[PDB]
Each structure stands twice: as structure tokens, then as C-alpha cells.
Amino acid sequence: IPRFGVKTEQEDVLAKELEDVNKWGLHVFRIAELSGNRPLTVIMHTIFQERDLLKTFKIPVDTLITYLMTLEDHYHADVAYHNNIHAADVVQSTHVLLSTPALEAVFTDLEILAAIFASAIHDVDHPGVSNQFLINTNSELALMYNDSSVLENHHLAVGFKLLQEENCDIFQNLTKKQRQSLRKMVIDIVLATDMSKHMNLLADLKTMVETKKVTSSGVLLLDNYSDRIQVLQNMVHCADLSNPTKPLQLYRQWTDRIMEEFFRQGDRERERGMEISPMCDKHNASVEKSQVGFIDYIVHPLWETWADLVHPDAQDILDTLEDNREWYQSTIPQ
Template identity: 50%
Template sequence: MRLIMAQIYNVPTTKTFSEETPIPELGVETPQPEELRVELNPISGERPLTAITYRIFQERDLIRTFSIEPHKLLSYLFALEDSYQQVPYHNKLHGADVCQSMHVLLNSSGIKDVFNEFEILAAIFAAVVHDVHHSGLTNPFLIKTKNDLAILYNNESVLENHHVAVAFKLLQADERNIFSNLSAEQMETLRKRVVDMVLATDMAKHKTLLADFQNLLEAKKMSGNDYLTLESYDDRILVLKNLIHCADLSNMTKPLDTYSKWIDRLMVEFWKQGDAERDLGLDISPMCVRSPTTKDKHQIGFINSFVHPLWETWGSLVYPDANTILETLAQNREWHEASLAALTSSTTDNS
């Protein structure tokens, strides 16, 4: 099994840091100034995931709180970043973006003081690892083609199981074990939370996840309690699952200039899968068809069916923090609708 796992993961060898290695300066205030001895400029351009995640760990004081050795954190982040494949969308930039989005969302009113530092550590870690070693192919494609990962994980959340397995496999090397100072009980608890959150990014779980979230918020509303009280693990992890789901689907809520770049990358990835499906004699997935209208049609449908209901529900929890987000989402949908109308009109005129 060890050989099989190694073949599947194919985690590359990467640079490690020792206690003597200078730790990058990230331009933020920190209670550990002695750890910040050189500038990050040589790293940040090529290492966005490392730079952003290290900065977040500093800003949230996670390094000191959990006795994380800085050289191990850098070694782990380098290995993690190298393990993100060079695919158009699900790459290290996406990992960094979702981590940053998680960091921001955790500061939303309504939940800012709800989660403890341990839960925040788990949430930030889950966000940055959530798509590591993504192949740029969807779960249905891997299942249809009987990919090794689909066989290994019995067709259940294939990619998501793989991502979280790779993330924890990287921790097995002593020089990368950023949680070495946690107790066995703490590590077991952290792992459970991270696994639960990463598996929640499987879009196949969206409907159930959102329904449970809506039921939780309705119960809160019925109780007349303005403050979110989450007494059970199930309730706390449910909110965290939806939080990482929001972070993962946050591109559509960002200004058009940023969002349009992300969606163009996603479509390149989809079209490559469509080409592979065609070459294998498979039915081409609707979002993978190379057509001028595919992008707009897919995004309008995806926003209406998945993204807007999710963010609207989240907005009710953190009101009014999500108002601008929902307005931007609506503007991006309108942009697609206008684009689709123009393309349709052009096709009609030319026929």
C-alpha cells in the first residue's frame, strides 16, 4: 500500500528550512521579530501560497499560539505549494486565494468571536490545502475513466479525499511537521476538523450542506438570539464547512476585473477536459463544450443554482457584511447575461 500511495501522490522533493535558515520578512507586525530576518521579495513572486499563508499565520499569531517552528512552516508550505499541479485553475494561486478568502471571512461580524484559535488554525489550514495536487479534472471524469484515485476512494469525493490525504502525508516528514508540538489528542481533533472541511468542498454535497446550514440559521432566528451560539461539534463544524464552501466559491463575488480572469482560467481547464472526453469517446460535459456561449451559460446557471443561494444564506448570518458581496455577485451575473444576449443576437443576425 505504501508503494501505491507514493505512486498516486507523487509528491515532489522540495526545499526545506533548518533552524539556522533566515525566516522571510513579510511586512506585518508580529510578536516574534527575531524570526523575521530577511525580506520575502525573492520568494513572494514565485511563492504566492507560501507568502500569503505565512503572513496569515503571523497576523493571527498562530505560530506563537501553537508553538509552530517557523522553519518547519516554511518547509511545509514550500512542499505544499510544489504539490499543487500546474493546471489552469486549481493551482497554487487558487489555494492561496481560498486561504486569503477564509482569513477575511473569519473576521465577518456575527462569527468573528465565535470560533476559538484552534478552530481558526484548522480552518486556515483546510483552506490552503483544500485542492492540493488537483489534476484539473472533475470527480465525474475520474470516476467514468476508472482513474486510480476513483478506485482508491470508491468513487466518494475522490479529489477531496486525495487533497486531504496529500496534505497530511506531507506532514509525515519531521522537517515539515508544523503540528509537532500539538498533543496526540489535539492532533486527532485538528485532523477531524480539517478532513470534515475539505470533504465539504465536494460540490456533490452542496445541496445537503446548504439545507442543513439554512435549518441551523432558522433555528437561531426562532430562538430570538441575535448572537450565534454553537454548542455542539456538529453545529460548529457545519458553519465551518459552509465557510470553506463560501471561500472556495468566492471568485464570483469579487470585482469583475478579478473575477473575469479566474473564470477564463476555469474555462481553459474545462475545455481541456472536454477535449479529453471527446478523445476517449465519452459524452462531453456541458460546461466543457468548446462553444462561444458555454462560459456565460454555465456561469449564469452556476450562480443561480449554487453560488447565490449559498452567499445569500451566509449574508443572513453576517449581515450587513455580505451586502457588497451580494451586489458584486449580481453585477457579475448581469455581465454574463449581457454577454450571452449579445452573442445570441450576433448568431441570430448571421443566420
């Protein structure tokens, strides 16, 4: 995109926007336009360089860029929510959560690499429909994964498979030991994004906040793998369910996108004479009531528990959530 070794006017504007990668509330949609619809590539690249992950894991730059573009190319541009913009956002969000004071120096570079790589592939090749819809139509995807976390298993499978395309193996220089460890952590994290796992994921997290233990600096202390992976699973899970905690201006865009996607599934289900899934009926919808419900039963209980784990780090995020809830509350038409 440059000319004579100097940034283009667009690149410069993009570079200036990217300066907020370490802040909750990055203008992720602005970055998607500026990057020519390459939010996931540019943001992952910026984060890998910010964290010096290329040197640490000897990842050639071109291989990194080639894989990222290939990964992004596999997110469907025609899907309203579960696309490359959602992935870029979950990546950036995870990146911010990883740098929380309460977790400073808690994770190794490899665990950090896993949290981020997992965030980047967690919804790749999402068809824009739920597991249940895939299950009810006897799709081969459902047949292949025995109707269990179909999409999630698929996202993982594809994320790894793309490492094999020409000059795409960003892990070519890791030892078998590192790769097996990285791989197990990424799998554990992504499978934990299947909402059907939510309740139990939160139950275990609350419990961890009970036996919780720290140091004289308030920094968390995680004994073994079981505790460290649990924090990472919930971290990415929070990032995936962070739309409601973002400045309303961003949140509203996420709401329109998820509803647009749900409504498309409802239309397809109606055409096919299937029962219209919950919240996927544009003729009997309550965008405001549903967002309030989403917040009261899932998002608030999750972030509240997280804010507790890293208290008081996630206070502003928690305040924003509660504020956005009241805003949606006051919007319900009587």
C-alpha cells in the same frame, strides 16, 4: 531574497500588496507574480503571523515555511484553475470570512487553524479533471477511494502525508487531543468541498439560519460541535465558491481559468471518444450563460444564505455578486 537584512525592491512591493490580506478582493494574481509563484506560501505565512498562530501552537518558523513550500509544490502549475493560486485565494478568503463581526470571538484558535489549514490543502495535487473522469477511466485513484469523493479524499490524504517530509510537521507540538480534534475538523471541512455535497450542505445551513440565535451584540451563538463545524464547512465552501463575489476584474480571470480547465478535460474526453462533460465542449460553449446559471442556482443561493447568517456583514459581497451577474447577463450574445 534580501541583501544585508533589508528587503529587495520586489519584496517591498510584495509586502505592500500583502497589506490587503484582511480585505475581500486582494490582488491575488499580482501577489503570485511578485512572490515568484509562491502565493500560497507567503499568504499562509502572513496569515499565521497576523493571527499569532505560530506562538499559540509552537510552530517553528522554518518548519512552517518548509511545509508551505512543499504543499505549494504539490499543486500543479500546469492546471489552469485548481492550482496554488486558487488555494491561496481560498485561504485568504476564508481568513476574511473568519474575521466577520457576526463571528467575533466565536471560534477557538484551534478551529481557526483548522479552517485555514483545510483551505490551504483542499485541492492539493488536483489533476485538472473531475471525479467522474477519474471514475470512468478506472484510475487507481478512483479504485483506491471506491469512487466516492475521490479528489477530496485525495486532497486530504496528501495534505496530511506531506507533514511527514523532512522538517514539515507543523503540528509536532500539538497534544494528541489537539491533533485529533484538528484532524477531524479539517477532514469534515475538505470533504464538504465536493460539490455533490452542496445541496445538502446548503439545506442544513438554511435550517441553522432558522433556529439561529445570537447575543445582545448581534454575535452568533453556536452551542455544540455540530453547529460550529457546519458553519466552518459552509464558510470554506463559500470561500471556494467566492470568485463571483469578487471585483469583476478578478472574477473574469477566474472564469477564464476554470473554462480553460474544463475545455482541456473536454478535449481529452473527445480524444478518448468519451461523452464530453457538461460545459467542457469548447465547440458548444456559453461562457456567459453558464456563469449566469452558476450564479443563479449555486453561488447566489449560497451567499444569500450566508449573508443571512451573518447579516448584515456580507452585504457588500452580496451586492457585488448581483452586480457581476447582471454584467454577465448583459453579455449574452443573442
